[PDB]
Amino acid sequence: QAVSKQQYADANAAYLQSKAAVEQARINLRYTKVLSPISGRIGRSAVTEGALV
Amino acid sequence: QAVSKQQYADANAAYLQSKAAVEQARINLRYTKVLSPISGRIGRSAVTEGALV
């Protein structure tokens, strides 16, 4: 009881936002490595280095 | 828990200071009527009107 319920609430809210932001950012980072879904013969790239995807 | 214990302690302390300050002001104000301690004969006033005491 050294702080109000509100102050704890506000601090807990900010934390939950941060937790969320991390998890999304982690997923996007993981997607920077475009991986093969299967083993097989890959063909031609429809995309050249330096292109925007 | 809408306020902390410190906040309440501080409000309680300010209130109690107020009680003490009213009592002292009441006392000062009662003393502006200077009263005879006993029945008897009074002589000369050693102090005039308009004097400082």
Curated annotation (Swiss-Prot), chains A, B:
Effect in UniProt of substituting residue 44 to D: Abolishes complex formation and thereby decreases drug resistance
Triggers of expression: By growth under severe iron limitation.
Subcellular location field: Cell inner membrane
Observed phenotype of the null mutant: Disruption of MexA, MexB and OprM significantly reduces active efflux of N-(3-oxododecanoyl) homoserine lactone/3-oxo-C12-HSL/PAI-1, but not N-butyryl homoserine lactone/C4-HSL/PAI-2.
Result when mutating residue 4 to D: Abolishes complex formation and thereby decreases drug resistance
Additional free-text comment from the UniProt record: In both X-ray crystal structures approximately the last 100 residues are not ordered.
Assembly description: Component of the MexAB-OprM multidrug efflux complex, composed of six MexA subunits forming a hexameric tube, binding to a MexB trimer, which interact with the trimeric OprM outer membrane channel protein. OprM is thought to not directly contact MexB; instead, MexA joins MexB and OprM by forming a funnel-like hexamer anchored to the inner membrane. MexA may initially form a hexameric ring complex with MexB prior to OprM, then OprM undergoes a conformational change as it contacts MexA, allowing the periplasmic gate to open.
Family: Belongs to the membrane fusion protein (MFP) (TC 8.A.1) family.
Function, in words: The periplasmic linker component of the MexAB-OprM efflux system that confers multidrug resistance. Functions as the major efflux pump for n-hexane and p-xylene efflux. Has been shown in one study to be involved in the active efflux of the autoinducer N-(3-oxododecanoyl) homoserine lactone, thereby playing an indirect role in quorum-sensing; but has been shown in another study not to be involved in efflux of this autoinducer. Over-expression of the pump increases antibiotic and solvent efflux capacities. Implicated in the secretion of the siderophore pyoverdine.
Protein name, entry field: Multidrug resistance protein MexA
Phylogenetic lineage: Bacteria, Pseudomonadati, Pseudomonadota, Gammaproteobacteria, Pseudomonadales
The gene coding this protein: mexA
Part of the full-length chain shown: 127 to 179 of 383
